Design a protein around this ligand. Sequence first.
Ligand SMILES: NC(=O)c1ccc[n+]([C@@H]2O[C@H](COP(=O)([O-])OP(=O)(O)OC[C@H]3O[C@@H](n4cnc5c(N)ncnc54)[C@H](OP(=O)(O)O)[C@@H]3O)[C@@H](O)[C@H]2O)c1
Ligand SMILES: CN(Cc1cnc2nc(N)nc(N)c2n1)c1ccc(C(=O)N[C@@H](CCC(=O)O)C(=O)O)cc1
Length: 178
Amino acid sequence: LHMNLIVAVDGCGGIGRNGGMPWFLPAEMARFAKLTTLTTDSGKKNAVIMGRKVWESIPPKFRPLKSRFNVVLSKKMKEESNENVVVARSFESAVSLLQDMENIETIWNIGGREVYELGLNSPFLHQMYITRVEGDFLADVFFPRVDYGRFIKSTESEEMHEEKGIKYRYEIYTIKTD
Ligand SMILES: NC(=O)c1ccc[n+]([C@@H]2O[C@H](COP(=O)([O-])OP(=O)(O)OC[C@H]3O[C@@H](n4cnc5c(N)ncnc54)[C@H](OP(=O)(O)O)[C@@H]3O)[C@@H](O)[C@H]2O)c1
Ligand SMILES: CN(Cc1cnc2nc(N)nc(N)c2n1)c1ccc(C(=O)N[C@@H](CCC(=O)O)C(=O)O)cc1
């Protein structure tokens, strides 16, 4: 059972501004949905684990994230009536429930700085799929401080991408104990 982190950070390490995203990148978001949705074993599902403010920053039409199992960490949210969503009061309990479910193939840590930090300290930590966006978007939330020395960066050829006047590039990292 793998836990991969997926994030889009800017030149300063920013991920959030004013409770929302500092940018909108539809092609990047499409790649995000593909990476987080597609499983190898047909019929098996992925799980996304997110913090409450991520959940609330998703457009409610796209919410819950379709074809995935949503786990929202929150100490304040009421239980979610929907079946593809569960509210988990702690990281450890969320990870316990996920490793308990048989049909979950890969757990995608999709955001919340604290969610990211707890994942980075997790035994299930596998890969980081980072989208390095160029420039300073005046973010107020950031990605955790991470020791990249624990990781091996994939060497595949990664071109630059540009949409909406914004440039960015994909990077992949794998924990060195694999
Ligand atoms: N650029 C990106 O790739 C990216 C990735 C994700 C999000 N974002 C942006 O980043 C910002 C949100 O990230 P955030 O870090 O500010 O808020 P968040 O982490 O998304 O959600 C924070 C909330 O999650 C809950 N939570 C987190 N860890 C928990 C734990 N261990 N146990 C229990 N509850 C826990 C708490 O909810 P309660 O307050 O209800 O306890 C906490 O207040 C938004 O702007 C979002 O759009 C961007
Ligand atoms: C605010 N937020 C958090 C968020 C945004 N961008 C990211 N970008 C990356 N690279 N990684 C992340 N974890 C990430 N997280 C959002 C907002 C909307 C949707 C969303 O609606 N996704 C659709 C896909 C949207 C699309 O196809 O354009 C899906 O079904 O997955 C996801 C995350």
